[PDB]
Amino acid sequence: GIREKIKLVSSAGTGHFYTTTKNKRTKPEKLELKKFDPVVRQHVIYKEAK
Amino acid sequence: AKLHDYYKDEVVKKLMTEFNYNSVMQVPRVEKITLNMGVGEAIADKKLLDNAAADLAAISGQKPLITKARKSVAGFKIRQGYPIGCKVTLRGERMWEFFERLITIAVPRIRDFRGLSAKSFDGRGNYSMGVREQIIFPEIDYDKVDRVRGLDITITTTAKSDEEGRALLAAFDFPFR
Amino acid sequence: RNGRDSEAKRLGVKRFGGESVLAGSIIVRQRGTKFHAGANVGCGRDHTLFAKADGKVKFEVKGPKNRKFISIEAE
Amino acid sequence: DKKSARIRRATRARRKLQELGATRLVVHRTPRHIYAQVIAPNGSEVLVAASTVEKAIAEQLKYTGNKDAAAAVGKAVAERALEKGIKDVSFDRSGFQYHGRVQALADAAREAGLQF
Amino acid sequence: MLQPKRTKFRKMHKGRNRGLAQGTDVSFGSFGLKAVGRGRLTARQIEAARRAMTRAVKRQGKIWIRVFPDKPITEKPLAVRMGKGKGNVEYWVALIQPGKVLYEMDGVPEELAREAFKLAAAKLPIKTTFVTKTVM
Amino acid sequence: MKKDIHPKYEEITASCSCGNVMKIRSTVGHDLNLDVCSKCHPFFTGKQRDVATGG
RNA sequence: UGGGGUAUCGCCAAGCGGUAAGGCACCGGAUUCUGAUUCCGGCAUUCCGAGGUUCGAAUCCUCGUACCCCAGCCA
RNA sequence: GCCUGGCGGCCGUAGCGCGGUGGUCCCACCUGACCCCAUGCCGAACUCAGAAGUGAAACGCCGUAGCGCCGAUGGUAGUGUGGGGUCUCCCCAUGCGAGAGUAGGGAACUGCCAGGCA
RNA sequence: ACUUACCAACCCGAUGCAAACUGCGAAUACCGGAGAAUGUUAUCACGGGAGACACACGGCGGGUGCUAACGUCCGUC
RNA sequence: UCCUCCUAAAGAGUAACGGAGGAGCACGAAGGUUGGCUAAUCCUGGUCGGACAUCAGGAGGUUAGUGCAAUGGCAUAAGCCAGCUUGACUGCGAGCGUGACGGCGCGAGCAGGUGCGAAAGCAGGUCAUAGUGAUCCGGUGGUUCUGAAUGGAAGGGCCAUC
RNA sequence: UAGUCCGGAUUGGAGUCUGCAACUCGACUCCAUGAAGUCGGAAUCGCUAGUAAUCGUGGAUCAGAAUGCCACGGUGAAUAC
């Protein structure tokens, strides 16, 4: 519905991204989640609420 | 602690004499005194409930707990979890100090004071009364009032019957018209 | 105004009492916890009860609420 | 009811430890005693028990029912449990907060060798 | 006419009418009009029979209608094909089995109870009989 | 009680016109002048003049 | 019979779920010899009836009523 | 042996209600709170330091069936197979056989450990 | 504040009804294990070739219909 | 098209223009964990305060609640509140369920790295069951795997994804 | 510069006088109360000089009852193309 799709990109040098959905209207703030990076193999901070 | 000591000698002794109790612990004691100020006009204004909270903070010696709505009802234009009153649960030493100020200097400063009603027991001894002004407490500055805000006191005690609460409260002389 | 129903989900008891199971085998695919998990039985995310060890299926009635457990006897 | 509220606080970890099948060290705090007993994985039979109502523990204490008494009990249960071949238990705090003298009892049981 | 004030679903399946009845003794009153045939009874037949009784034993006595309709019967209109939904709720019946005390009466002599129950059993579709209040 | 979220509740001394010097804890933070106390308030004389009307 | 629409002050007609807006009329004052015109003030419908959802219904849903419009065909 | 505490088996013949009793120990209420910790206010709860006082409440135990609960025997309902009729419903042979109700039972029984008394 | 042929919540006692009610609950069927006799492996897997996918009535359990139909739609034989 | 109940004959499945309702999402907390707590409604007393807003006590028992239908669940709570958080992880997966197939579902455990907890442990989204769309064609990021003489590149592949 | 030391209505209490008699239904006094009203919509009226405006005083009727009526004087305008 209204809830958009975003890419959580990795803070390490890799291009690896998780992908998910955000309500852009009610939460306009960016979304930072310490997720797992399998190219670095380490839990790195992910950014970019699209 | 003045009326707590007065309790521990003369009210315990007096009620052991009146009622023919066996245990010294079967005697009624006042558990707590809750001061509610259910403001309700804070559906539109927040500073009004903040001033109410400052007034219960002054009348007792504690921060009040701002209470929220349990159900939503449309009769009064409220909603679930909307903050609508504030209360202070006084117990322990501050219960006796507030009870001393209450029956000593706050109750006589009531306008047109005829007496407190004796039929204001809920069947289990627990008294509850209502003051119409916050001015009757000597702490509230008369020059700093904005809205007249009464409140309701509730003495909760460990008596089983309400005549037993007549006896307990009346042993502090607690006016009773 | 009517004329619709969902597809039948094929719930129920898949392995009955005394029936020998392997580990991992689903015993009761069900909807709440009509049957609860007992010894050597796990409860999945959709309340599917599955054999966590090998053995034999044991339907029992335990506890103060008369719940219907499903154990597995080691066999 | 205070006792019933405590038992329903206990129940989740109790049933979880009966589900895993681990020997549990059940504690029990009273306003003047602490009790500690090691119970088999079937839940019925005890193995080791020490407490402040035993005069072997109570005579060497100032007051049964404070943190020194509870540390004495934890040391006692760890000693007796190591004497009976029990090494690795799981701590059942039995509805109390792991804070005061149940923490003193369990820390004292961990210093004296009991593995949890 | 009798009809439940407020149902839970408007249309009921047919189902069958087997076995014997539950209301069997004359419970409230002293004389009873008990079913023998199976059948089912619309609300109009219950009302017709009750007016025959109430007229017959005049405004003395006391009459209990022990059955109640509560089962909606649907019919399709005329020149409507088969299919295209279930019909519409036309009336309401009670399902009767052999043994139902359909009516009770008290406060009259037995001979007026015979008379009113004859007068009213001729408004019902089932074979019917007269019973009395037996003591255990 | 918690820390400083509560108002300062210091013992003061109240005194009314009845000669009743009475020290109490109250969070006014100031000594107090009153008129009516529990001792010497017109409560019983008030009830008497209330009942004493008719004739 | 089905589908759609309407029901809001005495009349015609606006209303967005948290308040009922307009015109004509009516009421009071004034102008006038008097009436019409005019001018100054007012009032005013708890919204067709019943039930339900909602904290809250004119507003949303369902049913009934009353009046309109369209269809009710091929054989 | 009696009593109390803990952890279980069992899950109402075990629970409710009415009445009586217990505190040497145990337990509970209690005493105090500056500290460990805590309250969207409050040592009420949680927690800590204790032990003056009472078993009032609580809890345990003992009575009491007012109720809940268990519950036959018999009959009834239903029904598998075969057969029959007046066949939208029933009957026969045969196998299984309730629910409700009745007589009655009934205020539990028990294991491990620990402490107090004899 | 004073009277009352009227209605009536909740509670209690008694009486029925329910596909979308259940503090009870069969027969049967189904799944699993063991055992005997019988059966031309009747069973399963893999491979070659299909055909068929308009069904009908009759018993039993039902929906729809009017417990109407040589009606219609299922289950089972 | 998908979800729930009944029909549906006490395993599963089962039809009709049969009877009734819902979905085409929401949520970075409404997820994870740890610690705690327990409803509806009615009665009584009480300032404004009222049938119904807050307070206190009692009866009551989950008649409540569950982000949204219905059914089955739920007190050890799956309900309600707070602290810290990102397991709403990555690669796999014994074994099963379910479909003609395409597919869909449940999953203990193994490895790497993480959160909560003192610890046992729990966490691969949400009480569960709806919230959806094959292939082709093409877009974006990563990876020399390929790269029509050769070195690159273009294009293609593979992984992620629209 | 305030609904105020404006305004006095209204109302409670206490009285005096006249009069057979102040309840319906007088006048005045004292204490208390202290509304509305902050210059008046459409419209409308009077006045040309001792005038309008404003300030008091007297009388007739009358036992007592005028903010009316009829008189009397004090101060004293503006404006008329």
Curated annotation (Swiss-Prot), chain C:
GO terms for biological process: assembly of large subunit precursor of preribosome; cytoplasmic translation; cytosolic ribosome assembly; positive regulation of ribosome biogenesis; regulation of cell growth; ribosomal large subunit assembly. Signal peptide: none annotated. Pfam families: Ribosomal_L27 (PF01016). Keywords: Ribonucleoprotein, Ribosomal protein, RNA-binding, rRNA-binding, tRNA-binding. GO terms for molecular function: ribosome binding; rRNA binding; structural constituent of ribosome; tRNA binding. GO terms for cellular component: cytoplasm; cytosolic large ribosomal subunit. It comes from the Bacteria. The keyword RNA-binding applies. SUPFAM superfamilies: Ribosomal L27 protein-like (SSF110324). PANTHER family: LARGE RIBOSOMAL SUBUNIT PROTEIN BL27M, RIBOSOMAL PROTEIN L27. Part of the 50S ribosomal subunit. Cross-links to the 23S rRNA. Cross-links to the A and P site tRNAs. Belongs to the bacterial ribosomal protein bL27 family. This is Large ribosomal subunit protein bL27. It comes from Escherichia coli (strain K12).
Swiss-Prot record, chain D:
GO terms for molecular function: 5S rRNA binding; structural constituent of ribosome. It comes from the Bacteria. Residues 1-16 are annotated as: Required for binding of the 5S rRNA/L5/L18 complex to the 23S rRNA. GO terms for biological process: cytoplasmic translation. It holds the Pfam family Ribosomal_L18p. The protein has been shown to contain a phosphoserine, which was required for the protein to bind to 5S rRNA. However, the presence of this phosphoserine is controversial, and it has not been seen by mass spectrometry. Disulfide bonds: none annotated. Keywords: Phosphoprotein, Ribonucleoprotein, Ribosomal protein, RNA-binding, rRNA-binding. This is one of the proteins that mediates the attachment of the 5S rRNA subcomplex onto the large ribosomal subunit where it forms part of the central protuberance. Binds stably to 5S rRNA; increases binding abilities of L5 in a cooperative fashion; both proteins together confer 23S rRNA binding. The 5S rRNA and some of its associated proteins might help stabilize positioning of ribosome-bound tRNAs. The basic N-terminus is not necessary for binding to 5S rRNA. It is however required for cooperative binding of L5 and L18 to 5S rRNA as well as for binding of the 5S rRNA/L5/L18 complex to the 23S rRNA. Part of the 50S ribosomal subunit; part of the 5S rRNA/L5/L18/L25 subcomplex. Contacts the 5S and 23S rRNAs. This is Large ribosomal subunit protein uL18.
From Swiss-Prot, chain E:
This is Large ribosomal subunit protein uL16. It comes from the Bacteria. InterPro entries: Ribosomal_uL16, Ribosomal_uL16_bact-type, Ribosomal_uL16_CS, Ribosomal_uL16_dom, Ribosomal_uL16_sf. PANTHER family: 50S/60S RIBOSOMAL PROTEIN L16, LARGE RIBOSOMAL SUBUNIT PROTEIN UL16M. GO terms for molecular function: rRNA binding; structural constituent of ribosome; tRNA binding. The modification N-methylmethionine is found at residue 1. Keywords: Hydroxylation, Methylation, Ribonucleoprotein, Ribosomal protein, RNA-binding, rRNA-binding, tRNA-binding. The modification (3R)-3-hydroxyarginine is found at residue 81. Gene3D superfamilies: Ribosomal protein L10e/L16 (3.90.1170.10). Is hydroxylated on Arg-81 by RoxA. The modification is nearly suppressed when E.coli is grown in anoxia. HAMAP family: Ribosomal_uL16 (MF_01342). One of its GO terms (biological process) is ribosomal large subunit assembly. Belongs to the universal ribosomal protein uL16 family.
From Swiss-Prot, chain F:
Its cofactor is Zn(2+). The modification N6-acetyllysine is found at residue 8. Zn(2+) binds at residue 16. Belongs to the bacterial ribosomal protein bL31 family. Type A subfamily. One of its GO terms (cellular component) is cytosolic large ribosomal subunit. Binds the 23S rRNA. Part of the 50S ribosomal subunit. GO terms for molecular function: rRNA binding; structural constituent of ribosome; zinc ion binding. GO terms for biological process: cytoplasmic translation; negative regulation of cytoplasmic translational initiation; translation; translational initiation. Transmembrane segments: none annotated. Keywords: Acetylation, Metal-binding, Ribonucleoprotein, Ribosomal protein, RNA-binding, rRNA-binding, Zinc. This is Large ribosomal subunit protein bL31. The chain holds residues 1 to 55 of 70 of the full protein. Proteolytically cleaved by protease VII to yield a peptide lacking residues 63-70. It is not clear if this is due to protein degradation or is a bona fide processing event in the strain used in PubMed:339950 and PubMed:10556732. In strains B, D10, MRE-600 and Q13 the only protein seen in PubMed:10556732 was full-length; the last 7 amino acids were sequenced only for strain MRE-600. Binds 1 zinc ion per subunit. Only 1 ligand appears to be Cys, the other are thought to be His and either backbone amides or solvent.
